[PDB]
Design a protein around this nucleic acid. Sequence first.
DNA 1: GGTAGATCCTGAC
DNA 2: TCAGGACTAC
Length: 252
Amino acid sequence: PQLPEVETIRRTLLPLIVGKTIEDVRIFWPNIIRHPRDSEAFAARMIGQTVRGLERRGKFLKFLLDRDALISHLRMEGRYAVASALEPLEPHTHVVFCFTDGSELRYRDVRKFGTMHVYAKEEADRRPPLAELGPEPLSPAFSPAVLAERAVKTKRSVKALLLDCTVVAGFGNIYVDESLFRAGILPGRPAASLSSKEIERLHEEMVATIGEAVMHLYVYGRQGNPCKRCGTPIEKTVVAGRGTHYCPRCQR
DNA sequence: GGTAGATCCTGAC
DNA sequence: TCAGGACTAC
Ligand SMILES: [Zn+2]
């Protein structure tokens, strides 16, 4: 899931778990647990805590309990569901939080790429994976000025810059390619080669593209098909190690 | 320090 | 054979 989907999860999951008290935590793929490194310590500390809130930072979910916060990233295919402890688990369920009311919060992930970190609330923001996280793309903290500062200071491509979590929080591949197309900028351009006008325009399209989503694709996954704006075949290459889609006519 | 590289894991080739 | 987000060593 991408940022907009993660926000939808935050909104819809919260009422389904708020005020419930953890009675058990069951872990079927320990690699997912990143802190405490010992999955048994992870499970033990959460027991007896009540869910008080659920926040999002970038593509991370932050479950707020009594003492601790649980920081969760779903990566490509992770998913949460709330269901009865009386029913069989779905395939690829790797972590389960059991509540005193007989319901469960279940984490599934076919690829097993997702991560979980637990810390005392007051420490969560200054430890990985939240430490160093850039500003929310939809917040005043993410400004053309901030983007300009990072752009001028690097030798990397503009695509690499946008993919960097320290630059802006949770801006995914699909939105990078769509934003660059909408801003008329080739993904392979050196970030420092962008004019102030290009930076401004890119910031604007980033906010609009992801803003629209949180509430129709031009290039992403459209290789070999005609550009919706000029009819030129969309091309796909690799930029910053990622599948990268662009129109060689609309983007410069 | 900035930056590439390595890394996980398995469905779809 | 390999893409895909967010500690190590060049
Ligand atoms: Zn075009």
